[PDB]
Amino acid sequence: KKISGGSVVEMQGDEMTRIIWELIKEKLIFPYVELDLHSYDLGIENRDATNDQVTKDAAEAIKKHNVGVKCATITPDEKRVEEFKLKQMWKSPNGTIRNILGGTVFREAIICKNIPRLVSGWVKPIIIGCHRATDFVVPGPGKVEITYTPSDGTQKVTYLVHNFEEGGGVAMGMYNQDKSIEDFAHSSFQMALSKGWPLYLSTKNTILKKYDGRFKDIFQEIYDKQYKSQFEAQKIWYEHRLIDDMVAQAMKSEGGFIWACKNVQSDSVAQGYGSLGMMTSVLVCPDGKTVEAEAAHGTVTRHYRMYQKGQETSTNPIASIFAWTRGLAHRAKLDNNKELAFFANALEEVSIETIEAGFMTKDLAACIKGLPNVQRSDYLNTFEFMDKLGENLKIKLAQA
Amino acid sequence: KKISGGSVVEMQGDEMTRIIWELIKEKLIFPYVELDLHSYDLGIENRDATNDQVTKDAAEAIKKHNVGVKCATITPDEKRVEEFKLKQMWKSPNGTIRNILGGTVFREAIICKNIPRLVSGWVKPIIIGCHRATDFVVPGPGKVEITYTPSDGTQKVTYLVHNFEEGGGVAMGMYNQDKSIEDFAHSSFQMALSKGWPLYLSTKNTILKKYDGRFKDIFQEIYDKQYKSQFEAQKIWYEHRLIDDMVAQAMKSEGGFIWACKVQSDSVAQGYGSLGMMTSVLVCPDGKTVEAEAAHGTVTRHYRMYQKGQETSTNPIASIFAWTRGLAHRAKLDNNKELAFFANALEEVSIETIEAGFMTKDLAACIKGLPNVQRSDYLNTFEFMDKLGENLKIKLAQAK
Ligand SMILES: NC(=O)C1=CN([C@@H]2O[C@H](COP(=O)(O)OP(=O)(O)OC[C@H]3O[C@@H](n4cnc5c(N)ncnc54)[C@H](OP(=O)(O)O)[C@@H]3O)[C@@H](O)[C@H]2O)C=CC1
Ligand SMILES: NC(=O)C1=CN([C@@H]2O[C@H](COP(=O)(O)OP(=O)(O)OC[C@H]3O[C@@H](n4cnc5c(N)ncnc54)[C@H](OP(=O)(O)O)[C@@H]3O)[C@@H](O)[C@H]2O)C=CC1
Ligand SMILES: CC(C)c1onc(-c2c(Cl)cccc2Cl)c1C(=O)c1cn(C)c2c(/C=C/C(=O)O)cccc12
Ligand SMILES: CC(C)c1onc(-c2c(Cl)cccc2Cl)c1C(=O)c1cn(C)c2c(/C=C/C(=O)O)cccc12
């Protein structure tokens, strides 16, 4: 008999990841854990068939059950419309999901002793947390001003945006509500507490004194009113940093901090570097309770094209495995479920250990060696890597 | 017999870059090129002494003579005011110069075969053309609106930015003149032709339909009406891309393009450890007036050690390329084949020197990782300059 996992929302996706996601389910999860599974097929054809209703349902299911684990999905553009004869250019499922749950996205590279890090010298995890405008055409010369009127009618403040003198142009107004800034600090301070790392907030503070200053202020305020306690408990701390100083400190750091930044191209850097397969993602809702976990990468279309043509593929499943493990860890925490907690942690260990023992997908070998120097014998194919992880997991679980 | 290089505006600067600037003039330029040299000292002391007049005169001189080359300067802050006991906290020299010249800053990484790039697929250079606002605290409930008053006394136009119904927040207005958008286009269309490459503009125009839509519209209008012909004749083209699509395209690209977009860059370059290899060119819409400089600062930290008579290893490459880019433009303007050659030769010897294994510590780190770097891996500031000097002298001898 196996573990009772409780209620999990699961979203199937597209292309190479759809394949890996099933392998993850078949080989790593279902053998050991039983779930009250709420599964939504967010494959692109099923989204088209249901007029995207399945995406909305999936999001609502996450609101209800607190835990969502999601497979990468195709975000349609014109080419995707032609390729699948879509009825419409459906919105990003991610956009729809985040819009309904709200919250803050945290990214974290999974690290292995034998895998080079972006910055040589990083030794501990780094988690990066990231945080409607009225734009119009100004058709000729004239004054654009922005005006605030308190509802108590006591005052009016008008700021000049710009005197257009030589012609027209464009202007826009933007705003943030305090609440949203509060939510972001909450998610941030809590993640720092959940991971036991210090938290830094970076802003451009000096350019937009008032806009960024309000982040600085609310973070400090919330810190001082609700976290300085627990922070000294775990022996961590919170500080604000100018982005320029933040980048510099991080350059010299050993790692082991949460980095909230007001703004982003985190994936793009991991992508160029060749380690997007190791980059995971969790959306933390303000409420402390609801999370959605997923890989940071997409559907790996290029590998899917190879697969469909019968070429061997070597696609890294780690980010996707860690979507499940962070999902289950959080489910475990809500349910005070020692067995689930043990299982999740176990699976991450197996995944990190396997790689460290020298078995890895081609992307990671390229990371070690540079792509020109990779031999087929340096890596495992997609199924080969999954089977290895499967055996090691069996072994690890058949003890203690 | 030295080359007659013609009219060049040069601007001296601050701190570590100031030392290097002189070494470049004395070791790499003056032994080979005679200039009608318009030198302005934009050193912080001298800016203070002249009440910043020197910065304005430098800018006027570039306007008159078309070619500027500029050393990194200190932008005063509060700490800086105290440090030099300044009269005021002078505006940034680069700000003053840009407002007088107008134009667009193009950034370009100098590429060496042995120095890893941000994406391993990139074979050829990429040139990024990057294009303030009014923000305030909203202290509580009430209405933020943004207003356009046409100067021809036609009726006032009001847009709601947001009703704050509970609590406060922040708000800003921003703007962009058609004229500056037209310039952006001309400068980008100019740059592409000069370098003989396709040009992409990335916007977010599905989100900011009117604001980013204005950029897209005006780029197209100006291409169609005035530039397409000259683009097809060099077998290049212009295209607009949404930012996500553009990033994706760029991930899979070989390079060899101009990228016009609307502070992430310094972060990436700084983060990798390659700020010494980033050059910057302000390109005016007239196709005639340029101003070249290092994209990095005055390297205060290295200057601190140098004041203490300790060894430094500061990368002069971006500063050198400020000269070679300015001289190449000057050479192009006056059809000066000797100077053109000399500028290329100086760029090539610089790259080749690095490629042969002689480099400054920063580039050793890129190769080895900072913790794995030792003294015998690199040259100090003065050794490296000397090395470039011998190699340049040998190269030119072989060219004759
Ligand atoms: N959250 C989501 O649902 C997301 C969805 N997408 C969607 O995914 C699709 C593919 O987008 P695309 O731009 O190709 O981006 P992907 O992130 O899917 O792939 C980009 C490249 O990154 C590398 N890579 C990414 N993940 C892995 C992995 N697990 N193993 C090995 N290498 C990996 C590969 O490099 P190489 O080619 O060198 O092997 C790959 O071709 C699109 O349809 C897009 O809409 C995109 C991002 C997020
Ligand atoms: N063009 C201009 O006029 C500009 C001027 N500035 C001014 O420069 C001053 C100092 O700014 P700072 O924040 O230190 O920014 P810098 O870019 O001057 O230095 C930041 C760090 O980047 C690395 N680096 C930069 N250039 C080189 C190089 N040539 N060789 C080796 N390493 C290099 C060093 O890292 P490490 O310390 O790890 O060795 C350095 O300390 C400020 O007063 C600022 O106003 C800033 C930007 C542009
Ligand atoms: C800001 C926007 C224009 C942008 O969007 N996405 C990237 C990006 C890419 Cl394409 C891939 C990886 C990492 C990043 Cl951030 C990116 C970006 O900042 C940059 C785009 N390039 C090409 C650079 C270079 C160039 C290096 C070179 O030629 O070797 C240097 C520093 C920043 C960027
Ligand atoms: C925008 C801001 C958050 C930012 O600022 N500066 C960096 C950066 C650093 Cl610190 C150094 C090098 C390259 C970069 Cl771009 C940076 C940035 O994008 C990133 C910061 N980190 C830590 C990462 C990681 C993490 C890797 C790991 O844990 O092994 C992956 C991809 C992007 C970033």
Side-chain angles (χ1 to χ4, degrees), chain A residues 109 111 117-119 122 126 128 243 247 250-251 259 261 264 266 269-270 279, chain B residues 268 271-272:
Chain A
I111 68 188
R117 291 199 56 197
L118 188 60
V119 178
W122 288 347
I126 300 175
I128 300 177
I243 182 65
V247 168
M251 271 330 108
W259 181 350
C261 62
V264 209
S266 214
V269 172
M279 176 86 50
Chain B
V268 174
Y272 255 66

Side-chain angles (χ1 to χ4, degrees), chain B residues 95-112 114-128:
Chain B
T96 299
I97 289 161
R98 278 191 293 268
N99 291 352
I100 285 154
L101 295 187
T104 304
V105 179
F106 292 86
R107 300 250 172 133
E108 172 178 355
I110 306 321
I111 300 163
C112 287
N114 53 336
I115 298 285
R117 292 180 67 194
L118 187 61
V119 166
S120 82
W122 288 354
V123 179
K124 303 139 95 58
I126 298 168
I127 293 173
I128 298 173

Side-chain angles (χ1 to χ4, degrees), chain B residues 33-46:
Chain B
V33 173
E34 277 303 347
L35 293 169
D36 279 343
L37 194 63
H38 304 269
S39 305
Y40 299 87
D41 191 344
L42 299 196
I44 184 61
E45 307 91 337
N46 189 53

Side-chain angles (χ1 to χ4, degrees), chain A residues 134-135 140-142 144-145 147-149 151 160 162 168-178 211 251 272, chain B residues 134-135 140-143 145 147-149 151 160 162 168-178 208-209 211 271:
Chain A
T134 313
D135 59 323
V144 179
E145 300 167 292
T147 291
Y148 167 67
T149 307
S151 37
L160 181 70
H162 183 72
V170 291
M172 59 175 278
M174 266 167 74
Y175 76 83
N176 246 265
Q177 280 207 131
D178 278 344
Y211 212 103
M251 271 330 108
Chain B
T134 300
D135 56 323
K143 188 185 281 272
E145 296 172 308
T147 282
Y148 166 57
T149 312
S151 74
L160 177 61
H162 184 67
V170 286
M172 48 195 304
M174 311 183 22
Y175 71 94
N176 251 287
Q177 276 154 134
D178 289 341
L208 293 187
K209 283 214 204 197
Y211 196 102

Side-chain angles (χ1 to χ4, degrees), chain A residues 8-77 80-81 83-84 86-90 92-131 133-142 144-155 157-165 167-178 180-203 205-208 211-215 217-224 226-251 253-262 264 266-283:
Chain A
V8 169
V9 187
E10 177 234 358
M11 287 146 281
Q12 309 178 164
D14 294 292
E15 297 180 328
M16 206 58 205
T17 37
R18 184 187 191 80
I19 293 163
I20 274 148
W21 191 263
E22 286 297 313
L23 295 180
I24 292 164
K25 277 149 84 203
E26 306 284 6
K27 299 183 176 316
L28 308 179
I29 307 300
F30 283 171
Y32 305 105
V33 174
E34 289 297 4
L35 294 170
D36 297 322
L37 201 48
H38 310 267
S39 312
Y40 299 80
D41 185 358
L42 296 196
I44 172 70
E45 304 99 328
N46 189 48
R47 288 182 272 144
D48 193 59
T50 58
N51 293 308
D52 216 25
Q53 187 65 49
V54 63
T55 313
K56 293 189 277 253
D57 290 4
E60 285 308 318
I62 311 167
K63 264 242 256 165
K64 198 192 176 175
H65 297 292
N66 292 114
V67 182
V69 306
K70 175 182 177 305
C71 177
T73 41
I74 291 163
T75 288
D77 54 14
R80 296 302 201 164
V81 167
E83 154 187 23
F84 290 95
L86 299 180
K87 303 157 178 184
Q88 288 185 203
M89 199 176 290
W90 308 103
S92 167
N94 308 286
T96 300
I97 290 161
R98 297 190 232 103
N99 176 69
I100 285 165
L101 295 175
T104 298
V105 169
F106 293 92
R107 260 149 180 115
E108 180 191 346
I110 302 306
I111 68 188
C112 291
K113 285 142 163 58
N114 65 329
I115 303 291
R117 291 199 56 197
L118 188 60
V119 178
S120 166
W122 288 347
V123 159
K124 292 179 297 251
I126 300 175
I127 305 199
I128 300 177
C130 263
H131 172 15
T134 313
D135 59 323
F136 48 102
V137 164
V138 173
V144 179
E145 300 167 292
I146 189 167
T147 291
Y148 167 67
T149 307
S151 37
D152 66 30
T154 67
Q155 84 171 73
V157 183
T158 298
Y159 307 85
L160 181 70
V161 175
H162 183 72
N163 263 287
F164 290 77
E165 285 171 313
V170 291
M172 59 175 278
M174 266 167 74
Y175 76 83
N176 246 265
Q177 280 207 131
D178 278 344
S180 303
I181 306 163
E182 277 158 20
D183 290 351
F184 176 40
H186 277 324
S187 298
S188 290
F189 284 121
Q190 279 179 51
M191 170 87 10
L193 277 194
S194 157
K195 293 285 175 160
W197 305 120
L199 160 74
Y200 307 74
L201 168 71
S202 70
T203 77
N205 206 22
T206 43
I207 307 181
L208 311 173
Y211 212 103
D212 285 0
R214 190 70 157 197
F215 279 70
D217 283 350
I218 295 175
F219 264 62
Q220 195 63 55
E221 289 178 17
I222 288 170
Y223 182 55
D224 286 355
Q226 326 199 205
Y227 295 107
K228 201 178 181 214
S229 262
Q230 320 190 231
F231 258 64
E232 281 153 2
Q234 282 194 62
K235 283 173 164 66
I236 57 198
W237 59 89
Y238 162 87
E239 302 208 16
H240 167 273
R241 284 276 183 286
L242 287 216
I243 182 65
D244 309 72
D245 304 341
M246 186 59 205
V247 168
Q249 174 213 314
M251 271 330 108
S253 166
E254 264 164 77
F257 49 93
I258 306 319
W259 181 350
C261 62
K262 139 134 181 70
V264 209
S266 214
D267 313 333
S268 310
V269 172
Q271 189 172 151
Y273 183 67
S275 67
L276 197 55
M278 297 303 274
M279 176 86 50
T280 72
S281 196
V282 60
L283 173 77

Side-chain angles (χ1 to χ4, degrees), chain A residues 15 17 20 70-77 80 92-94 98 107 267 271 274-278 294-303 306 314-320 361-363 371, chain B residues 244 248 251-252:
Chain A
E15 297 180 328
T17 37
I20 274 148
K70 175 182 177 305
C71 177
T73 41
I74 291 163
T75 288
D77 54 14
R80 296 302 201 164
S92 167
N94 308 286
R98 297 190 232 103
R107 260 149 180 115
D267 313 333
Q271 189 172 151
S275 67
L276 197 55
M278 297 303 274
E294 54 189 337
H297 58 78
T299 74
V300 210
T301 304
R302 195 178 73 72
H303 298 193
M306 294 191 302
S314 183
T315 313
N316 192 338
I318 291 299
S320 309
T361 47
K362 175 170 189 199
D363 52 316
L371 177 55
Chain B
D244 298 340
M251 288 306 158
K252 291 177 308 177

Side-chain angles (χ1 to χ4, degrees), chain A residues 331-332 334-337 339-374 376-378:
Chain A
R331 164 88 277 157
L334 293 177
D335 293 358
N336 300 102
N337 183 327
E339 281 73 11
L340 190 49
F342 183 88
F343 172 83
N345 184 257
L347 176 44
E348 296 192 352
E349 286 176 345
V350 167
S351 316
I352 289 166
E353 286 162 0
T354 299
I355 296 173
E356 281 182 346
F359 314 92
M360 76 191 72
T361 47
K362 175 170 189 199
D363 52 316
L364 294 185
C367 265
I368 295 161
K369 299 200 185 216
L371 177 55
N373 300 307
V374 180
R376 167 64 181 87
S377 52
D378 279 323

